Design an enzyme around this catalytic site. Structure first.
Site, PDB file in Angstrom:
ATOM      1  N   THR A   1       0.845  -1.223   0.000  1.00 54.01           N
ATOM      2  CA  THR A   1       0.000   0.000   0.000  1.00 54.01           C
ATOM      3  C   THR A   1       0.865   1.252   0.000  1.00 54.01           C
ATOM      4  O   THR A   1       1.976   1.252   0.520  1.00 54.01           O
ATOM      5  CB  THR A   1      -0.940   0.032   1.222  1.00 54.01           C
ATOM      6  OG1 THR A   1      -1.525  -1.262   1.411  1.00 54.01           O
ATOM      7  CG2 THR A   1      -2.048   1.065   1.042  1.00 54.01           C
ATOM      8  N   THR A   2       0.347   2.316  -0.602  1.00 52.63           N
ATOM      9  CA  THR A   2       1.007   3.617  -0.570  1.00 52.63           C
ATOM     10  C   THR A   2      -0.062   4.678  -0.739  1.00 52.63           C
ATOM     11  O   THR A   2      -0.730   4.711  -1.777  1.00 52.63           O
ATOM     12  CB  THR A   2       2.056   3.736  -1.669  1.00 52.63           C
ATOM     13  OG1 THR A   2       3.098   2.783  -1.439  1.00 52.63           O
ATOM     14  CG2 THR A   2       2.645   5.143  -1.691  1.00 52.63           C
TER      15      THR A   2
ATOM     16  N   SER B   1       2.403   0.492   3.757  1.00 56.31           N
ATOM     17  CA  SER B   1       3.624  -0.304   3.821  1.00 56.31           C
ATOM     18  C   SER B   1       4.667   0.171   2.819  1.00 56.31           C
ATOM     19  O   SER B   1       5.869   0.025   3.067  1.00 56.31           O
ATOM     20  CB  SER B   1       3.301  -1.779   3.586  1.00 56.31           C
ATOM     21  OG  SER B   1       2.865  -1.999   2.258  1.00 56.31           O
ATOM     22  N   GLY B   2       4.237   0.731   1.687  1.00 56.24           N
ATOM     23  CA  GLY B   2       5.146   1.238   0.679  1.00 56.24           C
ATOM     24  C   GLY B   2       5.644   2.649   0.890  1.00 56.24           C
ATOM     25  O   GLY B   2       6.520   3.099   0.147  1.00 56.24           O
TER      26      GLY B   2
END
Lengths: 213, 213, 229, 225, 228, 234, 231, 227, 224
Positions: free
Chosen positions: B1-2, B148-149
């Site tokens: 995810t970002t 997470s990214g």
């Protein structure tokens, strides 16, 4: 503050039921006729839309309803009838029988005759329907008693309309003959101001179909 | 995810990827949700939690917008204009962000979502808020990043940022940031969705690009 | 015999208990609010308790405040008014708790008017005997003043008077437009109206919001009132 | 009237509903209780239409537990519900103490229940007066009479119901201490027969002993001289 | 909260000649990651009361909103300046909140300091309280610095350090603190303590915020970087 | 005739008394449907220092749905809040916007529970509701204190009941592009109110609200538009 | 002042609502019950509303509660149906509890306790219906129980309720015997229903008749009474 | 018809039940309370129905520096007294400081008000005189209708008009007079209401002076000096 | 309604309940330094005399004489017994007589619902006892007002017994003097053992003690 407003009279009468009966007697006429292969229920300012004012309504695919009395009372009772039919269908997995729905609605109507702080329903209902035990027509009063009929009338001038239909009604009739007799009775009591519903799933006849009949 | 949100001169640009989950369950997911015409929100964490608090906040924002109205008369990209030209009744970004913070904090025993609210209003101009895992709000006057990214682009965004970026260079910065995060992170991928929020109009860009060096 | 309950319409289509509450509020102590050039001013004449000479000087203060920048005053019973004011404070606190921002005035007016209206419906509750002025001032929006009647209504004014002799105060104050008058120059005229409509020093309560209070609730100082008297 | 005061004080100082419950008791049938050394005799009027009504169904003498019995006068449905409550409390005491409930305890409980029903909101007073008979913790037998007012009292002999004063006077001028079972039965018969007509079918009489509450057969009731 | 995620580091607070001086660095760490480095960690309760925290940020924000609502509740029911609540009252409220939360096994993951001035004689600041917009020497008995623990344990001292400072700054304070200290002496002592904390604590930073609770109210000095 | 129960005649007189209360306010409001739009025009007056801009009868239940209540003001605002709560509950449970018809059904059920129950007073409140359904056609649903809903092509609340039906019939029969349709519907509503009230109306004392397919959002036209239409009619 | 105070005593120690309910039951249609050596017989009268009714399947007086218990109604029908539902619920509840069919007397006691509860607790009107509950159990045998709105019941060998129940009771007293066959019981029921209406030849179109025998319940079809009428 | 229940407003706009509750105070015995810049003294007439009856207690402690006098129905006074005592001790347990008398009187007035709205409940038939020294001396009056008032001097009960006239005459002396002079003034006011060692209750509270009923002997020479 | 005021400020139900406590047999309570005594009267031969008891013990150190509606009196005494034993459990000592009297008074006005019964009790209680403050005797009425008394009487012949109590009572009286005073007052108003039932609680023991027939005959013989 839960005290019954409906109370036994000294002459052994629940006069609120009599007054609700007078109210439904003052309302527009309704009738139902049961044939060998069908069952029909029918009823009688230029700005009101005819689409939004249908007295005849559907509870289930093979159960229809009409009323005489107050509109809002009919709307809440129609919502309750639909909910009870839906809960029966969810439980037993099949469309509700006419008699069970009539018994449930009769019990609910009788409850408000006795519950503290409320008054009885000011209307009389007519269930029509079809199931494996044949065709069914059931009248429910403000008292909460359910009556099984071959043919009946409810609202204004119901005694004269009952006499007319009694001399006209036969057990062995068709949907065409039943609709013709219903239209005759309605015009006697009285196309634009007629509603008919026939029950094969329950159906509402449009104004074109009623004009054809 | 970002999920990224960057403030620039007369505007704020939010951006997100599309990948959901080792097996990619979905690859076209709208992580940026429209709370109101002047207010958007980027989601991170569990999808069920994110969807439920976001639709609850949409409901609360509708209630707030209805209550904010005053009586009487006064006074492949896609683009929209605000129905509320002067922001007479659109809720503020801080109000929505703080009720979201309270929602996530009251049920933080199991909720595990992190949000980035981005919007515009006449009081505080453009606005960015970050609601963390336990339900702590911080106003990020320059930029917010989560997912997470996002860990792979902290130094990149920190080095490339300027105070009063033009729309073009801010768009290039946020696009390259999400691209680098997708390149480095297995959990993020797919097409890039960007939402540019200004005083008068909202723009919604979709970009398909990869990384070559 | 249709007036012995708030939950029954008479044949004329009206609730007589509400009209009796209006009669109770109208023959009570006087209150007024006015919107000046750069502030609002609130005055309260407690002249019904002039016979009681044992009262501590300047302690019966009908003026109250919410969030330090909303004035709320009343005419009616004291306890019911305190109930309404406590509900208003609770609603403002709940709004800040949810949204981290002070409540707008008109939303508070609608909420408290709904709270007052809720008691006029049921047959087992006494309707509120109080008419509430709730007001605020801002640098940019200027003054907004709302009167909530006991019937649940709520109306916005540029100046309002309730209580006894409200007609006299209304016709007296409807002579000069105060939107081009400073709030310091209005206290003299308000005192003159109180004379027209010894005990003036102690049976009067005053409050103000303008520049000199930094747009926040305050009571006018004695040294400011005395030269104006 | 879910929570309303039905029983309230009158301008004089009385509770009118308790007096009306006393009137309802006065309408009820006549019952009589007599004590002896270690046994009791309860005799109660019966009223059955001949040849149609089942004689056995009506039952005014009731067994409450191993060692208590009851004989009421007033409203029958009220008596049935009160007797069911009394039986429930008898078994509750025998569960909570591991001894049978004595007569004084259960009489006090019935009186307390009636007082509670004359005092709580949204509740009507009991229209019944009871003559409980039983045995104590010290094996002594006694009879407790309880009014609709919630006042109880122990008695050597007592009568309730319609024309209770006449039977009370007859019991006063004919009672003796420690009389035999035949004499006690005969005294109960001639006492309750002072107000009800002389016939064998208009009465049912039972004798309470430590072992069980025996019922006198109709043949033994017959031939009363 | 089931445990901390975005954690705030230590706070230091001392009494001095003119009032209270309380210092905290503006860092909030997301595990072992300086996610935020401009976080306001010392809160102004009222004109003579401030609060600081070390622990989870969400719990501290919740407690700050609670005490803010208590402050406006007090201000609404106010007629004279003596009706205002001292730091003792807020300290007792926070202690009771932490104790009740501790009884349910559901604490606020925080250690809190409540500090300020415990008397009204030195100024008439609360004659006209404004929320939206030379010093006097105050006796040590009229000042207040409190500590409240996650278990509800609480107490008072002339100088309180909460968090990782309890081992590092406190020792230095227990050698260097003295009664009736000037602003400069208090500032250099606090700066030395924060320098030692910065050099020997991972979660701390060198970007400090000092707040003075003095006779002229609460004063937020502009934040600064510790030199070297 | 105190409780909401049946009389020996069979009628419930409390509903009639509530309808009398609604009529006593002397507030007139005319709702008119169109080809692809609906208009409500209301009189904007109380049921010198008073703020006359603040006085309104129209309300925004939602961006799409709007309404106009007439009757007691507290009851009007309470019914407005009930309508907003009902629409919000529908949107939360179902995830799509309620229409005027279903909202009127639910509001009249809420009115009926007060109608049947003795312990509840009836709301002295009538109301028109308008919006656009999912087939891109207008709606105009009217309810009264009796708890009875009905859809209308045009309707009036106020004193001139069963008298404004005549002029509405005449105007709708006489009338029988989206911009031209909206303009004609607004002109018909304004002319209907002017003919009903029988005195010339100033633009600063009437309020006209429009919903249409061109602009789905409920909005009120400014005073300049009403002045233009009044000059056009004369 | 709107409370009518239904649940209060009178100066004469009476509950006025209860007596109003009884004299309302007296104005209802006639119901008859009796017991024979083989089965319990129940019968009723139908208030002619119209010939347009579905009489084919219409028993508005006699109802089944369980395969061992059935009842005949006299009073308000809507008040009777809810009590019949409660009776069925209690019968199946007893069977669920004790793995055994209920006795008749226990069910009578339960429904009469509900009637007493309505006449004592709350502020609600009583149930204005009387039941003749017939049934069979192994403990006692064939039983017939009469009930009232007051919650007071009594067991009977043969009795009547509704309008002109004095004449029906007089005919039952004259004719009923302890040893009677099923056919004799049906003929006596026909005779009592005839004499109640002051007609020598009963009308089959307005007579409901049913019985229970040791268990099986027979509801006589409208044709079946015609054989009994001629005999 | 308009006084059958407490929720019905009269056509004039009056609550007859609440006014009857207000009438209930006038049957109580006379009580007086006065103050200076430092001290507050409360006097009361204890009720003695017969010579075998002990006098009825008239003055009650609430806190270290708060006490009360009552006039009306004694059960209502006991209920309100217990409520005030529990409120004061709950504040002293939750917090390490004394409760504000303003907040306590507001709480008691709200408790008074909450009974006059619901039809089930009835208004409190008792008037309360709260004397205290929070940081300066103060007297408060509380009425059945939910209102309360400050007072420099106060009196009420049976035949309280004469004591009220004495207070109206001598109000301007009480500020500067000493504690002895203030006690004599209060005792003379109570005397004008109509005094022995039993039928008179007396209590003082002020700066560095908790609630304290004056002893029998001290009251004896105070009454002698009153003569 | 039960919760309604007269125009004179007096509650109607309390005023009506005060009429109920007049009825019933007469009883007297006398307190002296050495102890406290309560004598009482009982109203055919079939009733067991010992079953009906006009004197009850709220605790080991408390007794009472009751009048009015006797079932309500039994309810009040049961409540007082439960609360007194609760105090003795929670604090491990005897309760003051004033505290028990105040508990009974608090239950008496529970029907008002100021902060569950539904009417006044219509019972007058004359509760005697010995605590750390010595002997004492309190009087409670349906109005909820308590009154400490040196000596008092309740029941039908209240006024005559009160007049004799004013005339004949002296503070410095021996216990036998109080005994003969009680029996003299009862003799005047209405004397074998069957008429009178006596109980005493003394400073020596602080225990309830119901008098026997021998003691009743003894103090009858000591009388003139």
């Amino acid at each position: 503050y839960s005290f019954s407003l409906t109370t036994f009279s000294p002459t052994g009468k629940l006069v609120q039921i009599e007054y609700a009966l007078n109210r439904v007697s003052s309302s527009s006429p309704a009738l139902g006729i049961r044939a060998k292969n069908g069952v029909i229920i029918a009823t009688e300012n230029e700005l009101i839309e005819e689409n939004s004012i249908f007295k005849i309504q559907q509870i289930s695919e093979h159960i229809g309803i009409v009323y005489a009395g107050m509109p809002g009372d009919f709307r809440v009772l129609l919502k309750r009838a639909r909910k009870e039919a839906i809960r029966y269908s969810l439980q037993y997995g099949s469309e509700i029988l006419v008699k069970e729905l009539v018994k449930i609605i009769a019990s609910i109507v009788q409850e408000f005759t006795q519950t503290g702080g409320v008054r009885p329903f000011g209307l009389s209902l007519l269930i029509c329907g079809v199931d494996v035990y044949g065709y069914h027509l059931y009248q429910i009063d403000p008292s909460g008693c359910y009556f099984n009929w071959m043919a009946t009338c409810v609202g204004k001038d119901y005694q004269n309309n009952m006499s007319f239909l009694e001399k006209r009604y036969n057990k062995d009739i068709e949907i065409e003959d039943a609709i013709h007799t219903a239209i005759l009775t309605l015009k006697e009591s009285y196309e634009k101001n007629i509603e008919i519903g026939v029950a094969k799933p329950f159906k509402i006849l449009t104004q074109n179909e009623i004009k054809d009949y | 995810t970002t999920i990224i949100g960057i403030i620039y001169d007369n505007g704020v640009m939010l951006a997100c990827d599309s990948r959901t989950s080792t097996f990619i369950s979905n690859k076209c997911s709208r992580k940026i949700n429209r709370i109101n015409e002047n207010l958007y929100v980027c989601r991170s964490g569990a999808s069920a939690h994110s969807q439920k608090i976001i639709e609850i906040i949409k409901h609360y924002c509708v209630s707030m917008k209805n209550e904010n109205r005053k009586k009487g008369r006064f006074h492949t990209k896609n683009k929209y204009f605000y129905e509320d030209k002067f922001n007479d009744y659109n809720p503020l970004v801080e109000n929505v962000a703080h009720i979201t913070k309270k929602i996530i904090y009251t049920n933080n025993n199991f909720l595990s979502c992190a949000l980035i609210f981005g919007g515009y209003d006449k009081i505080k101009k453009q606005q960015l808020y970050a609601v963390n895992l336990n339900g702590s709000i911080i106003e990020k006057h320059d930029f917010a990043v989560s997912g997470s990214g996002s860990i792979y682009i902290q130094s990149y965004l920190q080095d490339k940022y300027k105070k009063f970026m033009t729309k073009k260079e801010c768009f290039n910065l946020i696009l390259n940031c999400v691209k680098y995060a997708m390149h480095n992170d297995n959990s993020s991928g797919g097409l890039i969705r960007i939402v540019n929020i200004t005083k008068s109009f909202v723009e919604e860009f979709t970009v398909v690009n990869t990384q070559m060096n | 015999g249709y007036d012995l309950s708030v939950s029954t319409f008479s044949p004329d289509g009206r609730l007589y208990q509400v009209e009796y509450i209006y009669k109770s509020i109208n023959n009570n102590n006087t209150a007024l609010c006015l919107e000046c050039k750069d502030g609002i001013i609130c005055c309260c004449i407690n002249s019904n308790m002039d016979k009681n000479k044992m009262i501590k000087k300047n302690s019966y203060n009908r003026i109250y405040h919410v969030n330090n920048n909303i004035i709320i005053t009343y005419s009616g019973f004291d306890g019911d008014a305190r109930n309404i004011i406590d509900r208003a404070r609770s609603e403002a606190n709940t709004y800040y708790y949810n949204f981290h921002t002070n409540i707008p005035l008109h939303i508070l007016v609608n909420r408290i008017s709904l709270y007052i209206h809720a008691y006029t419906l049921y047959w087992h509750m006494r309707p509120f005997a109080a008419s509430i002025i709730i007001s605020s001032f801002n640098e940019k929006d200027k003054g907004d003043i709302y009167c909530i009647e006991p019937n649940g209504a709520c109306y916005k004014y540029s100046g309002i008077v309730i209580g006894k002799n409200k007609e006299m105060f209304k016709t007296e104050i409807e002579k000069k437009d105060y939107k081009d008058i400073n709030v310091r120059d209005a206290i003299e005229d308000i005192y003159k109206f109180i004379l027209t409509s010894n005990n003036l020093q102690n049976l009067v309560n005053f409050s103000w919001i303008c520049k000199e209070s930094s747009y926040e609730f305050q009571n006018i100082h004695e040294e400011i009132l005395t030269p104006a008297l | 009237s879910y929570d309303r005061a039905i029983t309230v004080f009158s301008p004089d100082g009385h509770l009118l509903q308790v007096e009306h419950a006393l009137e309802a008791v006065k309408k009820g049938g006549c019952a009589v209780a007599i004590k002896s050394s270690n046994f009791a005799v309860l005799a109660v009027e019966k009223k059955n239409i001949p040849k149609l009504q089942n004689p056995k169904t009506t039952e005014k003498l009731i067994k409450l537990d191993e060692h208590n019995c009851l004989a009421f006068a007033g409203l029958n449905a009220d008596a049935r519900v009160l007797v069911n409550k009394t039986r429930l409390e008898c078994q509750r005491y025998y569960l909570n103490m591991d001894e049978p409930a004595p007569v004084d305890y259960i009489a006090k409980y019935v009186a307390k229940v009636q007082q509670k029903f004359t005092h709580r909101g949204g509740v009507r007073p009991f229209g019944i007066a009871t003559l409980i008979a039983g045995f104590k913790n010290n094996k002594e037998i006694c009879i407790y009479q309880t009014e609709p007012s919630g006042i109880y009292a122990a008695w050597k002999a007592q009568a309730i119901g319609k024309n209770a004063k006449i039977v009370q006077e007859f019991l006063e001028k004919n009672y003796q201490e420690n009389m035999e079972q035949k004499d006690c039965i005969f005294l109960a018969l001639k006492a309750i027969f002072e107000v009800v007509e002389l016939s064998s079918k208009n009465v049912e009489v039972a004798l309470l002993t430590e072992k069980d509450l025996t019922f006198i057969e109709e043949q033994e009731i017959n031939s009363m001289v | 909260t089931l445990g901390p995620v975005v954690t705030g580091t230590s706070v230091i607070a001392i009494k001095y000649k003119h009032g209270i001086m309380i210092a905290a660095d503006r860092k909030a760490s997301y595990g072992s990651y300086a996610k935020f480095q401009n976080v306001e960690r010392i809160f102004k309760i009222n004109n003579k009361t401030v609060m600081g925290f070390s622990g989870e940020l969400a719990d501290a924000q919740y407690l700050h909103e609670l005490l803010t609502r208590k402050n406006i509740n007090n201000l609404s029911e106010k007629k004279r300046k003596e009706d205002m609540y001292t730091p003792q009252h807020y300290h007792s409220y926070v202690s009771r909140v932490f104790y009740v939360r501790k009884n349910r096994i559901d604490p606020l993951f925080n250690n809190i300091i409540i500090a300020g001035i415990n008397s009204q004689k030195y100024d008439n600041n609360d004659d006209n309280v404004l929320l939206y917009t030379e010093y006097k020497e105050i006796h040590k008995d009229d000042l207040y610095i409190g500590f409240v623990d996650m278990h509800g344990t609480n107490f008072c001292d002339d100088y309180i350090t909460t968090g990782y400072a309890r081992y590092f700054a406190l020792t230095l304070l227990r050698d260097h603190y003295k009664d009736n200290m000037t602003e400069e002496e208090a500032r250099i002592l606090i700066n030395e303590c924060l320098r030692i904390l910065y050099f020997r604590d991972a979660t701390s930073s060198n970007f400090i915020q000092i707040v003075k609770v003095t006779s002229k109210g609460v004063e937020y000095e502009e934040p600064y970087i510790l030199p070297c | 005739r105190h409780l909401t129960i049946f009389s020996p005649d069979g009628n419930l007189y409390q509903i009639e008394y509530a309808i009398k209360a609604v009529k006593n306010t002397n507030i007139t409001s005319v709702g008119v449907k169109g080809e692809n739009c609906a208009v409500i025009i209301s009189q904007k007056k109380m049921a010198k220092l008073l703020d006359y801009n603040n006085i309104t009868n129209i309300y925004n239940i939602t961006d799409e749905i709007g309404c106009s209540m007439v009757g007691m003001p507290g009851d009007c605002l309470s019914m407005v809040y009930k309508a907003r709560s009902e629409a919000s509950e529908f949107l939360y449970s179902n995830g799509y916007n309620v229409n005027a018809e279903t909202l009127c059904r639910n509001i009249c059920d809420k009115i009926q529970v007060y109608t049947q129950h003795a312990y509840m007073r009836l709301h002295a409140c009538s109301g028109m509701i308008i919006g656009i359904d999912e087939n891109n056609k207008p709606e105009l649903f009217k309810f009264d204190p009796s708890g009875f809903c009905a859809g209308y092509r045009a309707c009036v609340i106020g004193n001139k009941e069963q008298e404004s039906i005549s002029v509405l019939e005449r105007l709708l029969e006489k009338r029988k592009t989206i911009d031209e349709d909206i303009r004609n519907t607004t002109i018909l509503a304004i002319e209907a109110l002017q003919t009903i009230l029988a005195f010339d109306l100033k633009a600063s004392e009437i309020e006209v609200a429009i919903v249409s397919t061109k602009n789905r959002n409920f909005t009120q036209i400014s005073e300049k538009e009403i002045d233009n239409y009044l000059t056009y009619i004369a | 002042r709107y409370d009518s105070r239904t649940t209060t005593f009178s100066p004469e120690g009476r509950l006025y609502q209860v007596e109003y309910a009884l004299e309302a039951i007296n104005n209802a249609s006639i119901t008859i019950g009796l017991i024979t050596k083989d089965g319990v017989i129940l019968g009723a009268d139908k208030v002619f509303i119209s010939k347009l009714i579905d009489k084919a399947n219409n028993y508005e007086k006699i109802y089944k509660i369980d395969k061992h218990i059935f009842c005949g109604v006299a009073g308000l029908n809507a008040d009777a149906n809810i009590l019949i539902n409660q009776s069925r619920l209690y019968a199946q509840r007893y069977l669920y509890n004790y793995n055994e069919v209920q006795p008749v007397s226990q069910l009578v006691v339960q429904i009469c306790d509900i009637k007493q509860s309505y006449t004592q607790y709350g502020g609600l009107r009583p149930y204005g219906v009387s039941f003749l509950i017939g049934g069979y159990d192994t403990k006692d045998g064939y039983q017939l129980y009469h009930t009232d709105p007051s919650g007071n019941y009594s067991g009977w060998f043969a009795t009547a309720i509704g309008t002109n129940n004095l004449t029906a009771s007089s005919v039952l007293k004259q004719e009923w015997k302890n040893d009677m066959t099923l056919e004799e019981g049906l003929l006596l029921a026909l005779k009592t229903l005839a004499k109640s209406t002051d007609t020598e030849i009963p009308k089959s179109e307005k007579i409901e008749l049913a019985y229970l025998t040791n268990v099986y319940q027979k509801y006589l079809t409208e044709k079946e009474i015609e054989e009994l009428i001629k005999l | 018809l308009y006084d059958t229940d407490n929720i019905i407003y009269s056509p004039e706009g009056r609550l007859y039940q609440v006014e009857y509750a207000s009438e209930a105070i006038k049957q109580g015995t006379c009580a007086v309370a006065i103050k200076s810049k430092d001290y507050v003294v409360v006097s009361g007439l204890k009720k003695c129905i017969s010579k075998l009856s002990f006098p009825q207690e008239k003055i009650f402690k609430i806190d270290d520096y708060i006490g009360i006098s009552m006039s009306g129905i004694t059960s209502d006074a006991k209920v309100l007294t217990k409520f005030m005592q529990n409120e004061c001790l709950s504040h002293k347990f939750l917090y390490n400081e004394n409760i504000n008398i303003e907040s306590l009187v507001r709480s008691v007035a709200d408790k008074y008000q909450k009974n006059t709205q619901k039809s089930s409940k009835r208004a409190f038939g008792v008037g309360l005189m709260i004397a205290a020294y929070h940081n300066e001396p103060c007297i408060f009056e509380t009425r059945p209708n939910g209102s309360y008032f400050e007072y420099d001097a106060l009196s009420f009960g049976a035949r309280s008009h004469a004591s009220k006239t004495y207070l109206e005459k001598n109000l301007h002396l009480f500020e500067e007079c000493s504690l002895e002079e203030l006690i004599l003034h209060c005792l003379k006011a109570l005397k004008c209401s109509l005094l022995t060692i039993s039928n008179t209750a007396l209590a003082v509270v002020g700066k560095n002076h908790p609630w304290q009923e004056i002893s029998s002997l001290q009251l004896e020479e105070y009454l002698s000096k009153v003569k | 309604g039960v919760n309604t005021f007269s125009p004179e400020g007096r509650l109607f139900q309390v005023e009506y309940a005060l009429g109920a406590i007049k009825l019933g047999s007469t009883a007297v309570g006398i307190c002296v330094n050495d102890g406290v005594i309560l004598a009482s009267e009982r109203r055919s031969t079939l009733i067991e005399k010992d079953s009906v008891e006009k004197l009850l013990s709220i605790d080991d150190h408390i007794g009472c004489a009751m009048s009015g509606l006797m079932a309500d009196a039994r309810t009040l005494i049961d409540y007082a017994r439960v609360e007194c034993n609760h105090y003795k459990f929670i604090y491990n000592e005897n309760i003051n007589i004033k505290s028990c009297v105040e508990l009974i008074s608090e239950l008496a006005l529970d029907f008002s619902n100021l902060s569950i019964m539904s009417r006044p009790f219509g019972v007058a209680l004359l509760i005697g006892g010995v605590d750390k403050n010595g002997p004492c005797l309190w009087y409670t009425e349906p109005s909820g007002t308590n009154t400490r008394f040196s000596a008092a009487s309740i029941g039908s012949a209240q006024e005559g017994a009160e007049l004799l109590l004013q005339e004949n009572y002296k503070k410095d009286m021996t216990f036998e003097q109080a005994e003969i005073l009680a029996l003299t007052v009862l003799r005047q108003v209405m004397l074998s053992t069957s008429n009178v039932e006596i109980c005493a609680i003394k400073k020596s023991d602080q225990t309830f003690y119901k008098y026997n027939t021998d003691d009743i005959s003894r103090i009858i013989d000591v009388l003139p």
